[model samples]
Target chain A: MKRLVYVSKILEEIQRIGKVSIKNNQRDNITGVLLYLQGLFFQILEGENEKVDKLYKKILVDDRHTNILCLKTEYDITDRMFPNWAMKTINLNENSELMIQPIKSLLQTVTQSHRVLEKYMPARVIYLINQGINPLTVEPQLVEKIIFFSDILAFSTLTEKLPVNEVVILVNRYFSICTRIISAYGGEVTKFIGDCVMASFTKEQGDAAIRTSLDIISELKQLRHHVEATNPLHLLYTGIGLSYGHVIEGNMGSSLKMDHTLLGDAVNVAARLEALTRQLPYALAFTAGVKKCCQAQWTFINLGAHQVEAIEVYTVNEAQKYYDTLQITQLIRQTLE
Target chain B: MKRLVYVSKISLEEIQRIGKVSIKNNQRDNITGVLLYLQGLFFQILEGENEKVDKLYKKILVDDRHTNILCLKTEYDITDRMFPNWAMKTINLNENSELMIQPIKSLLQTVTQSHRVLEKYMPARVIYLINQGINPLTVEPQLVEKIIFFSDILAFSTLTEKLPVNEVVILVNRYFSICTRIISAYGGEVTKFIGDCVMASFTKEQGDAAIRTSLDIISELKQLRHHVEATNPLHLLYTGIGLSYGHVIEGNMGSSLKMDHTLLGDAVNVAARLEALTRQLPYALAFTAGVKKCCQAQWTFINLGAHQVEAIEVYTVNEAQKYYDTLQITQLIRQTLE
Candidate 1:
């Protein structure tokens, strides 16, 4: 048995050829995928060497293709990689909202599955092939999400005064506590910047993000108790900022050094709101955008439209009971009991 | 037959053109890739049969719309057709309803035209951050040690200060190419490039890589210098590099405008400060005590004596090689500009 892979420019429409390949491949037991992108055809064929070669032979002379470049032919003694996919087209018309989510995750799995085929092959081809099922059809989507940023209060002082080992204990310990709580609420922390961690959630998960922040603040009480008992700053506290709005994220920067991060007004507000917690008494703060999205079982203290650097969304908001900074720290301490 | 990645300089105003022309012409030749335009720079990747890709590249060189054309990477035998697929790294919120079950030609046209839509999409893991839990919060930040590497071009203010801004870009891009290529080869990850400075990090296992990388930069730039016009000042360019080791505190840091995945700590500061020390020292390279112990018999370390960097004694190499070669990305870029 063998697996043959190749790509070519389509001379004519391959709709009829796709249907015909399905019928013939199903009979030939050729389980594979035919990805159509920008009038180019990338195909993978699997079966006995004899049958795979026979179809590839026809494909060479096939008028539907202007030229054929065989990427590789793998000799294997194994079951089919895509046993269920007999001449799969990855048909782009099926790219409505409902169908994309499953395929998106499936592509991630297929990326690792076809690891052997990628060797010596250019990266672009392997990526597109793995991401088959309408790779190019999607339009830039503008979706709303809750952006959350939590930073260790007095981070500079912690790093400067504490030994490297203690700083590690404090940074990593707090990061893990936040990560665990954030995940439990179905929110994903996106960035760990210095003494801060940034997480995101869907608009519907507004309360989840809120609860996650509460949970992190709650968990930190014990974390600080455990660490402060050993060698600690007065106690560890985090400033969490929440903002919800539209963001369409992708790869940014030149090809030499590209970063997988996003930049939009909403993202900034979260960071701004996170920094806002520095002066205000609240450990957790949020923008009005997030405030309106959630009716969570928590107290809201609108600290009025406090001036924040850059862009609108001037209001400083918090989700907690009343107290000054030290008093609030005491409240958190008492709650742990 | 091949995938070609290249970057070039173009006029700022011409950003409006080339979409319909490139796409229509590309359909005829069967080339697929993406193009990005930022700050008067045009970066493109084109893939097609060997002869056609070569043929198109030849044509592109002669076209003269953009200048300082440099081929960054060329790969043979791509396994498949790779497209941005907004939903792959980026999620596409807009879904078309009126479309007839994807007529191949129409979809191809939509794809070619909509590639610019990618320009609208920028970074940060908002896509995965929303759809899944594949994020940093899923795991713990392991407290690993790294030798912080920093290299800043010497006399950057003097060299680029008076030059035409266009040439300044080409010079830096080429500088970046040399630095990034060498850093990775020596098992290092370039954390970020700040202006003329290159910030990278190396692990204990990849010992002495940071020092060798510094040596290579000076040697490579000296070679690139010969091709530069004597009076152009680029001819006088040199790089100062430093290395320091400690437990790396890796994370993302930046403004509300953008986020940078960076490695920060006193160790990193020592590297940068030592890099600045290169401006005063006789040698172009320097390393802290942490890396000096990792050195093999080949390196001859010259102690400059330790400054109060707060940690680690720093040293430099007396027997450093000069102008080994540019191996010539020099001549192509040194040619007459647009």
Candidate 2:
């Protein structure tokens, strides 16, 4: 369960030579993470046994990076660790909030640990074991239904509009607060979409799923209040949307370009319903279907027959609505007809 | 632009040991592309100067796919020539035309010429290039609009359920062909989509936007007649949609994962809502007030009042019954939207 990650960056011209030498020499199970910025290459390689052997051999002949900074090689102990992922390319920008936030949290933990691989267990492994879950178990086909949750309202636009360095500082502050809350509650942070975080509750047991959703939502609300008061964006409000339905969840797409995602109508409808909240002018608009199945005390509106994108006109309700964007509600309803 | 991409499922344990030794001995910019499978590993590494390193690295590591095989490295080339022989083309069996598959044609040429166990280039490198979606420029922001135009035949899910995956793909391709033809005909680009939706855009003229929409309507009618004759589950098809302006154009690179090009905006919201409209009575295509006014169609539309959502108020358009005199109701709109 303990793994190490090695990082390096190099210029563009020698890309071919560097790649060829590494692969030919390092016949090991050397998985890597790559980031190409401007004309330079940034990479993270991790593996065990022959993978390490082959990687070292390839690095020997590679003439791309001169400084060859080790960056940091830390031990990652993850029960859900994707040992099979040899090389993964992710655009931190596009991954759904449910997919990236946990990784971000893990990275943050690694950054803070300051421990060598031998000194500490892979924090990711610990995090995964804490949930008693494995990424491989998240097969979309096996999953009967998926509970899609996302924070649509966040201080993203305001932060993004700020200067890069300032934005980074603020974002770090923002994430530190939010990440801690999510992790403390035994919730997995998936990915971050701009200002929002996408998280999921994948418990096969019905009660656990409901409890998890409510717990995460309540936590998000507290986090929202805390951030709003301290951060520069006071006027900004946060909203969380939750929906559940059958979905095809799994590691889909080609092997080299695999995505651990939930496909099918359930995922789409959840996203649509979530977006609907932005128009509802609501603090939270829980899908009635999901709410009915849970033993939670909440008030909702019979929004009536409304047309949602890619869905038939279904009678839906607004689980919670705020006053700020009430007029937007009518606009969304108009599209449904 | 020349880039090096390594594709393999190299084991991590092996990578750590080998990488440690290599760094101690060589100290080079050798990157790895790691992929983890059921048991084995596939990996590719890219070693290059700093500039191209990140780009190549980015190209491989944007998706959270670190299963087993590790990518060792990726190098981007500023002025390189190796990849021209293999223009990164993509065959979205779902969207691409049969002719588009021919882009893979050149790959065969390379294979026939080289028959050695140890390839001139690393075998992983060759497979990496071939397996990657060919349309290197497919998701290029410069090529497509960050502001997208998304449309799809409404109720496609119900229809798809009746057919097999291949037929569904074929049916979707038919619509894609029409969208592509129209978008391309007007010097626009057709981007990929989720299921039935078609996202495309134009560069210069807002007027071109009107033309693409118009063409979408026209082509749908032509394809519908053909669908009616096919012995498949072809049911009622309607496309609800809305459109708004203002968004960022982006490529498929984010936080070092997978690469894909998609449009995001209030415009996309409008399109989705509009697509949803078809679920109701007869309204096929609808646009937001912003889009409706910006590109006033020559058709008469009833005001469907304001459509509301959780986020913002969006203007809605009623079903397009018919266009004014010189503005004839085209077959495209009738077939797809109606």
Candidate 3:
């Protein structure tokens, strides 16, 4: 009937209060978890409306814990988020080392993972419980596939030739086109490193990645031609490198700012290959591993083994021909019809 | 007994196998609920007796398939678990467009209802959604306080023009490695490396850390210059550093594929402007009044007077050549204070 979140300082031994709270909660049909960290108590109390409200009143007056701050209160939460925990105690010591085994075991038995409680419950509820903070709360991480790395061929020159505003506009336009093409091909552009763009795609979209890279190159070529034709002073070229492997992707930074990017050996290799493109005659390079996963037909020049990883390179023309043949076939069929 | 949720690295087929195993385990333990996997994160909800659920969760945590085991929500009560059928319902956040957006809308509403703006300290709601494998782009902009540090190598393009492409690449790599090592060492994060410039940040508890890190970076670059000259006399490396402290709105600032965590607002603009000013000033280091106030006593700063820095007029600090020579003041501050 009533749900309340409150933070208080522990006046009694945590184990002592925990045992007593469990018995009392079970008897009153109240369900909640008590988090003990750094001598602070963050308790979520839920039960019949009147009973919970009355109990909270008593808790406020209770001398067992002081400095009571009611974080949140909600009435008529139909289904209980934490139903089974009559009294689940999560103890986080001053060292901030989470006693994972006990906490994990207790959480698993409750059928409520820490994620559900933290999300649906109150903000800082866990921090209050932990007596500090959860690193993940501030810096969250994720996983992604197909690390796509690309950068402008002569970005420094372009910046030097064009004004800052013009450089910004050109870069923005380039990024816009790349983003559109990648997303159209089922990839997510993670971040822009100076003149470079990094994106990721799932395994199923390997062929799409090849297609997207080709499409971007095709588009950029036309863009370059148009800019060269109009301005004659501006020249734009791009090189792309792709790798397929598992990588840890996340919003990484301090609490003030976080950049969502992928980090792994795959990401590094892809970047290295992108940098490698600057020395090569071609504008596109990918690992043999990426080439193996691609479903689309394309030609690759064997660059052979260099360093620990072998490099296989391709050109936008190869991708162009593959699409050109398809277009020609479709046109022929239309003429026959 | 218990419930736990964790994110792990597992393939799709592996996830299916895990789902089957989980169903078997849940069935045996009388646990009920769903398991969702996307990209690589696994979110599971299992309900049963406290002991049985706790045992299964503990087993899952120790499983090698998963690495980041983050527990989301926990509770205890007499009510039956949500999914009574002992079924494992799987939802892919990326596959279901509606479902993906559903959580975002709900989360935004929760925060809006609480009347809290998304800022440097992420509202609990945002963090919760992210941990559950929600795309950060869904929740666009959030304001956060940070000390932004911007650095650019002087005459970088000139060097690029002179050196071979491979040589330039090697030089850039060396520069990046050095900057990354020093920035990370001082609890600073290098967010973006643009051309010959680097942008790093000290987001939490800014003032002292920003100043200290800034001084150390300047000191390190001088040492780096000597090392570079000794190793490769052909390459000349001189860097200009700028520091500013203030609030900036950070978010996925573009479309899905092109989206990146970009910093906005005047703080970022001013930091960039200060970095630009480095070329004109005698000193290699320049900072705004914002950072100056933070570590006033720690460093010997000369007031470079007022400049119309973008929309606001603010005083800039010149880390005089004397400070660069000895770094004695910096050393004293580092030893005595944070």
Candidate 4:
């Protein structure tokens, strides 16, 4: 037996392809799935060697399809990726704005949640997919960003002693709060690697990014006393590192799993800065390039030479308050300028 | 901001009782934090963010974690929050817990993350054996025949150091994107991105595909040269690829927090060493004896003698005229140094 996946331009109407293919495929005891997106049909068909080829042959001559190309083929397959799919049509019509709702509901039904990591996917990825761009194959672009990385100072030896279940509870809670504070400041959570929270902010958002770090430390103080009063052994102060530089922003990794993030020498610089915070006096630190937007908002003291050398500038440290929407915008704008 | 103090009979963990006091009073007055216990006393500190701290103390008066309450210190208004120097590590509690707790100070020593410790001291495979109710001593180390592929950017640090930070990132991302795409197309899996090098694994049957990928990358990089030189005149793009088909120790090296299932063996060592050896040679692609025997007849090969790094004789291999010759690439590199 063999399985074939193909993509083709839809000729006229696909409203009935779902209704027609399901009954035909069901009767033949063959299985597959069909997706209609952007006036294109992506279908996977699997059956006996000759049977699948014959169907593909007929599909090739059909007037309803054009520019059909074979995407992939697998032989001697033991199992199917879509065993119960059976010609189910993931009808993503370009005309409909409600496409997101169906995708979410499809993901939520009966054990479907366990099959995908959609829940942890970054909002930017969902936004791109919603905008008709395939994120995995998105082209990279040169971008300037303020990268931030934060790791819990307490996660090292403290978590080594934890039960698996307990570590989950702790990590989940920490990630939850950090992500909340980051998004609130217009920063995107790039990834959660090890015990670290990786994030990115547009160059213009650096003031807000610094403010986000302060908010995290402030909010965590609540968790601090609560835990200290209950179980004081687990301390959770974050060591944050910030770098302002250029990055090649893209989706990178193997075809099976790609990461949507930025990469370059600057990324490593940010990570190293985060590492320095572990031993450094300040809880948050950043390279010299990041000072433009944050200079007026916070005080930055030069600690001679350290971390990296021959760079344009020495790093700064930060670790603020009430305002309405207009006042908040105006104050931050003035400070950045 | 307001602060409260209360005395409670141990009903359960009345301490998180102080915890709840801090949450409520602090949630209200925004001056909330901590409920302390000195043997029998429950003291609560309430802080603010948006304020209502006084009412939270009134509500705290009627709770199951307490039998009696006292207002230790209620502040009218402070110039600023009392403690701007604190952080968090939270935990909830049960009943009759008269005792409270301790917070770990940053003075605590740790050389790395908790997960890294597991990798160095207690790797995942051993943990799995113990978790499976099986003795690791009884389990034999397993080996599987596989193809190891290693490719590195030539003079990565040296080249990138000369470019702007943005260009450095753009350069590496382009290489990684192209490498990932071609390798994945050839039925191989990239295991890790060590610095700027790409390490991948393939089945023995996929050895031919690995060599094909290397050649494709060379041709593609040559094609990408114009754009690179257009931006950074002297910053040339070049890569070295090495392939070896041999046995590897395949298993999980991940901690309970994560699982990393990868294959590592002498093939991996030889492949990387071969990649490093390219700096001394004119060829951009190289492969071991194992890969040579499995590859196709259409490819050309130039023997480079033994790479003493792994006691293996390596050869520079490529497809017909699709990529730059040794002297051509050599000329490019020499011209750049000028």
Alpha-carbon runs more than 4 Å astray in model 2 = A1-143, A154-230, A233-237, A248-265, A268-337, B1-148, B160-204, B217-221, B224-230, B234-238, B247-265, B278-283, B288-338
lDDT of each: 0.59, 0.40, 0.57, 0.57
Docking class of 3: incorrect
The sequence of per-residue lDDT tens digits that candidate 4 reaches over residues B1-338 is 33322333334355554455455434433353444333333434445542465456557567665543423224444556534322111232222243211100000001011111122122223433433434343343346677788887766655544555555556666777788778878887766554477777777777678888888887788778765555463247788887888866554322222223345345776788787777667676777888877766556777878768726888766442324454455455545643
Per-residue lDDT, model 1, residue A264, is: 46
TM-score of 1: 0.40
TM-scores vs. true structure, each candidate: 0.40, 0.43, 0.37, 0.41
Please provide, for model 4 over A1-337, each residue's C-alpha lDDT reduced to its tens digit, 9 standing for 90 to 100: 6777655666245657677777877776678877655455667788777667777788899997775645446678897655665676666454243313222222122112111122334545544543435555567666888988987664533343444444445555667778877887888876565456778888888788778877777777677666643342234567677888877676554423345656567777887787776555566777777777564556676645564654443343445112132343343334323
Candidate 1 local lDDT, A34-118, one digit each (tens): 7654455667788887788888888898776654555445667477766776787864434545434333222222222122112
Name the candidate that leads on lDDT.
1
Q: How accurate is candidate 3 locally (lDDT)?
A: 0.57
Q: How would you encode candidate 3's per-residue C-alpha lDDT over A1-337 as one tens digit per residue?
A: 7777665555346678788878988888998876654455667788797678677788888887875655456667778856887877766453232222232232232222222222222222322333322223433333447788887655544443444445545665777788888867777766565567877888777788888887887887777556644442234456788877655443333333223335456776778777776666566677767877777666666765655335445443453222232333343334323
Fraction of native Cα contacts kept in each candidate? 0.02, 0.00, 0.08, 0.01
Give the per-residue lDDT of model 1 (tens digit) for B1-338: 77765546563234435655666676567776665544345556676767876887888877777875545345678887554231112111223332332222222222322222221121222221212323322233345688888887665544443445444544565676788778877878776554366778888876667777877887888878887676554665667788888876664233222233455466776888888876666667778888776666477778878687544577877755333332222232344222
lDDT of 1 at B166: 46
lDDT of 1 at A102: 30
DockQ of 1: 0.03
Please state the error at residue A145 of candidate 2 in Å: 2.5
Q: Candidate 4 has what TM-score?
A: 0.41
DockQ of each: 0.03, 0.05, 0.04, 0.01
Superior by lDDT: candidate 1 or candidate 4: 1
Q: Candidate 4 - CAPRI tier?
A: incorrect
The segments of candidate 3 whose C-alpha lies over 4 angstroms from its true place after superposition are: A1-144, A232-234, A308-337, B1-198, B201-211, B214-338
Show where candidate 4 strays beyond 4 Å: A1-115, A131-138, A154-156, A228-233, A252-257, A307-309, A312-337, B1-154, B157-338
